[PDB]
Design an enzyme around this catalytic site. Structure first.
Site, PDB file in Angstrom:
ATOM      1  N   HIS A   1      -3.412 -13.883  37.959  1.00  0.00           N
ATOM      2  CA  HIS A   1      -4.029 -14.947  37.223  1.00  0.00           C
ATOM      3  C   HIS A   1      -4.955 -15.736  38.138  1.00  0.00           C
ATOM      4  O   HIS A   1      -4.923 -15.620  39.370  1.00  0.00           O
ATOM      5  CB  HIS A   1      -2.973 -15.850  36.505  1.00  0.00           C
TER       6      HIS A   1
ATOM      7  N   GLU B   1      -4.816 -14.443  41.987  1.00  0.00           N
ATOM      8  CA  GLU B   1      -3.663 -14.439  42.891  1.00  0.00           C
ATOM      9  C   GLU B   1      -2.660 -13.414  42.334  1.00  0.00           C
ATOM     10  O   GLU B   1      -2.498 -13.307  41.121  1.00  0.00           O
ATOM     11  CB  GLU B   1      -3.009 -15.804  42.990  1.00  0.00           C
TER      12      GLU B   1
ATOM     13  N   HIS C   1       3.618 -20.459  48.837  1.00  0.00           N
ATOM     14  CA  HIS C   1       4.159 -21.720  48.325  1.00  0.00           C
ATOM     15  C   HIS C   1       4.950 -22.440  49.446  1.00  0.00           C
ATOM     16  O   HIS C   1       5.634 -21.800  50.269  1.00  0.00           O
ATOM     17  CB  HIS C   1       5.073 -21.442  47.095  1.00  0.00           C
TER      18      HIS C   1
END
Length: 142
Positions: free
Chosen positions: A42, A88, A129
């Site tokens: 996405h 990504e 992350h």
């Protein structure tokens, strides 16, 4: 080239990625903006809106490749004829290919993503992350 990412888990965890395995994952990934079972790949906004304007207070990750650092053009569905943006996709220390159509259960994407371009699939870098598997993304080093 080995990339090192630091990710906090329920404590700081150090994770290593082979650049070759990650580039191979993005090549195997479909060129689609989330029209898959898992929602991956996405659009990775990098702090911009679909018109190429930097959102106030946000700071883009600088990759060092003109192809990656250019502001995007992203239509509502990621399919306008003039679109060019970042994608990504999940990437892992083992190099296995993420099951992008996996839905109930959706394969755990982990904390790391390979970033590459739409529509040409140019490799930008590996980001991860900070804590867990969602939230702020930070560029891994190498």
């Amino acid at each position: 080239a080995t990339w090192t990412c630091i990710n906090q888990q329920l404590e700081d965890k150090r994770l290593l990625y082979s650049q070759a395995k990650a580039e191979s994952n993005s090549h195997h990934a479909p060129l689609s903006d989330g029209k898959t079972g898992s929602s991956y790949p996405h659009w990775f906004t990098n702090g911009y809106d679909g018109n190429g304007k930097l959102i106030k207070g946000r700071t883009p990750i600088k990759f060092g490749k003109a192809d990656c650092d250019r502001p995007p053009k992203h239509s509502q569905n990621g399919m306008g004829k003039d679109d060019h943006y970042l994608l990504e996709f999940p990437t892992f220390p083992d190099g296995h290919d993420y099951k992008f159509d996996s839905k109930k259960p959706k394969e755990n994407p982990g904390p790391a993503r390979v970033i590459y371009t739409y529509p040409n699939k140019v490799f930008c870098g590996i980001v991860a992350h900070q804590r867990g598997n969602q939230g702020d993304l930070r560029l891994c080093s190498h």
